[PDB]
């Protein structure tokens, strides 16, 4: 069984900035009191969202 | 069967059959903790 919809408007796709938002730990290596420079899939700062 | 391992800085979940021995402190020894093996002096520590 599934619910149903109608008069559902199309998505509007308005866009915002990921202002420094969404950093994450890129790997399982424990690090402490260090600076690590790394190439990975990150969401860029001020990316469109 | 393909066994895929990982050796992270995380609690040991599977181990080899090695017998285990008492701690020796303040002496230079070989050591093997969870397969992490080296040589040095073991002491109590203030580390958290
Ligand atoms: C839907 O999109 C239009 C432009 O395509 C925009 O003017 C409008 O504000 C959007 N809807 C909402 C609720 O923001
Ligand atoms: C998408 O990104 C570019 C540069 O990141 C920006 O100029 C543009 O304004 C963004 N999209 C919208 C709808 O503003």
UniProtKB/Swiss-Prot annotation, chain A:
Variant or mutagenesis effect after changing residue 39 to H: In strain: Omicron/EG.5.1
Residues annotated as glycosylated: 48
Subunit structure: Binds to host ACE2. RBD also interacts with the N-linked glycan on 'Asn-90' of ACE2. Cleavage of S generates a polybasic C-terminal sequence on S1 that binds to host Neuropilin-1 (NRP1) and Neuropilin-2 (NRP2) receptors. Interacts with host integrin alpha-5/beta-1 (ITGA5:ITGB1) and with ACE2 in complex with integrin alpha-5/beta-1 (ITGA5:ITGB1). May interact via cytoplasmic c-terminus with M protein. May interact (via N-terminus) with host bilirubin and biliverdin, thereby preventing antibody binding to the SARS-CoV-2 spike NTD via an allosteric mechanism.
Reported function: Attaches the virion to the cell membrane by interacting with host receptor, initiating the infection. The major receptor is host ACE2. When S2/S2' has been cleaved, binding to the receptor triggers direct fusion at the cell membrane. When S2/S2' has not been cleaved, binding to the receptor results in internalization of the virus by endocytosis using host TFRC and GRM2 and leading to fusion of the virion membrane with the host endosomal membrane. Alternatively, may use NRP1/NRP2 and integrin as entry receptors.
Listed name of the protein: Spike protein S1
Lineage of producing organism: Viruses, Riboviria, Orthornavirae, Pisuviricota, Pisoniviricetes
Gene: S
From Swiss-Prot, chain B:
Highest taxon of source: Viruses
Chain positions covered by the region annotation Disordered: 9-31
Quaternary structure and partners: Binds to host ACE2. RBD also interacts with the N-linked glycan on 'Asn-90' of ACE2. Cleavage of S generates a polybasic C-terminal sequence on S1 that binds to host Neuropilin-1 (NRP1) and Neuropilin-2 (NRP2) receptors. Interacts with host integrin alpha-5/beta-1 (ITGA5:ITGB1) and with ACE2 in complex with integrin alpha-5/beta-1 (ITGA5:ITGB1). May interact via cytoplasmic c-terminus with M protein. May interact (via N-terminus) with host bilirubin and biliverdin, thereby preventing antibody binding to the SARS-CoV-2 spike NTD via an allosteric mechanism.
Role this protein plays: Attaches the virion to the cell membrane by interacting with host receptor, initiating the infection. The major receptor is host ACE2. When S2/S2' has been cleaved, binding to the receptor triggers direct fusion at the cell membrane. When S2/S2' has not been cleaved, binding to the receptor results in internalization of the virus by endocytosis using host TFRC and GRM2 and leading to fusion of the virion membrane with the host endosomal membrane. Alternatively, may use NRP1/NRP2 and integrin as entry receptors.
Protein name per UniProt: Spike protein S1
Lineage: Viruses, Riboviria, Orthornavirae, Pisuviricota, Pisoniviricetes
Residue numbers of the full-length protein present here: 511 to 558 of 1273
């Amino acid at each position: 069984t599934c619910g149903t919809l109608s008069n559902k408007s199309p998505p509007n796709m308005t866009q915002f900035s990921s202002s420094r938002r969404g950093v994450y730990y890129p790997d399982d290596i424990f690090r402490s009191d260090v600076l690590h420079l790394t190439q990975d899939y990150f969401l860029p700062f001020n990316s469109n969202v | 069967v393909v066994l895929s391992f990982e050796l992270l800085n995380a609690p040991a979940t599977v181990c080899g059959p090695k017998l285990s021995t008492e701690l020796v402190k303040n002496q230079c020894v070989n050591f093997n903790f969870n397969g992490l093996t080296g040589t040095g002096v073991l002491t109590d520590s203030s580390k958290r």
